[PDB]
Amino acid sequence: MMIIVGVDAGGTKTKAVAYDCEGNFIGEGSSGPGNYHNVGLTRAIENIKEAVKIAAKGEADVVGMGVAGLDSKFDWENFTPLASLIAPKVIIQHDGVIALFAETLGEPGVVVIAGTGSVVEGYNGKEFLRVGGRGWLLSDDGSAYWVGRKALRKVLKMMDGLENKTILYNKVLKTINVKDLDELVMWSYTSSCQIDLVASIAKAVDEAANEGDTVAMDILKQGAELLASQAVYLARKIGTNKVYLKGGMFRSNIYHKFFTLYLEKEGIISDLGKRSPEIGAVILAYKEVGCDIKKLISD
């Protein structure tokens, strides 16, 4: 019958899930980044189309998508037209909006997305509010890019002899395949503006942290608390006592722990939640075309 696809077009990757209109799962698909600021509009759209095609096993009737990078009116006006050519019916929203809707389903609340970039999104019963979520230079506190940059800067200070070399040191050098200061410099000058390459270093930080390296742990702690502070601010403003946590950074057990500890000390409850942003997009699509959301229930 009808094929409805929900999509999370993020900075790290694009994830899509397809369902019919009767709540039944059809399939899933993944592709590259959906943030056009990082891969360009042509490729971002191509990646979304690919993820959708894979999940639907062909053409889709309705596509709902949460998108990273729609940070200005300019961003929206150039993205919308192209994204609408993907299927007969297409629904587009900022990724923070979809991630939050996926969980609160129309009710007030706050969600945090911590992936290649980051954002805190809330809903006060009347409108959506955003804190951060404006790119790597201006924002993205506690994101993978933010963590990767901090690690790179720390590694140089270790090479300079300013600080002792820790586990993090070799984890980073191996990740980007660099053996000395000279190679690190060259890597930086040709990788400086490639957000994905810097963000990829967050994995090295997580590995070093899991092995007890306080230097790596400090980076994760600072990033998590910088972002968590924004979540606490918005939660208090909206009047909610809980915040939902989504994104690849929360797959870092230590990062997640520092984030939850901060929220808890500030009287806020954290919840990873049961609903992904992509299924949130499916739900929004269901509402748009009239499919019964309760049919998605399964056990």
Added chain:
Amino acid sequence: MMIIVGVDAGGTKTKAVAYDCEGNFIGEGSSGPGNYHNVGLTRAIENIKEAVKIAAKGEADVVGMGVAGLDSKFDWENFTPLASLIAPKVIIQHDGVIALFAETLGEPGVVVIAGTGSVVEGYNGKEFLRVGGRGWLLSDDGSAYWVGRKALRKVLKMMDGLENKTILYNKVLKTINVKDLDELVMWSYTSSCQIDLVASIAKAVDEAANEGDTVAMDILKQGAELLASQAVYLARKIGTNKVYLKGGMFRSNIYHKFFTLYLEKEGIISDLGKRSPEIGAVILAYKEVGCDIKKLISD
């Protein structure tokens, strides 16, 4: 007679001073950035040639230059060949080396350059040692770029309502001609990789600081201390009780004050010095070709 030109090819601008071989001043000239990482090799060389031509009022016989951006073997091998076509005799060194030589004239010591980028350079009697000075992404703590980025990130948090808007807020918006969050985002996406545009914001921070804005002062303090800590490390390693301070950031009275206060609390004496990096290059050229450095003395 013989025309000798000393050049400081930095991240902010290129400055040149011409003298004959008898210690007499001929003229000075300025042009754009000499750091090829920021303007490309073609333009960097063009800027150096222009500054030299202006100062010498024509062709020069000898050109000595301190250059920002020679941070790897790769950088040197591509820069040297072109720079040698500027005059019959050309001497090339990293800018930190020349800035330090200008003051200690062959003796051990430590110098700090804080301009668009930053670096701490020392000499232990046998070789030159560098700390930092590897570009905007990996380093440049307390540089104009570093300060500009911190200001931009703070301004967004003010727009988000996370912190109260201070004097700094409007100083920044006016500097980059932006009126709201939407325009700031667009500016960021088209100015993100233009180091000069981000570094230009340091002026706004200085203005706000001079007017008593603690938020702007905090940025200058953090940057100055991050860089000053590196200077203290190198001064102690080399065994010197003083550090020379050079660069446009020291024209910020508050930045300079925070820098000197930190050094002093750590038992180190600061000195702006009497000799510029460009005259340091003239002195090195004098040594190379056999002109008497003492002839430069004047009153």
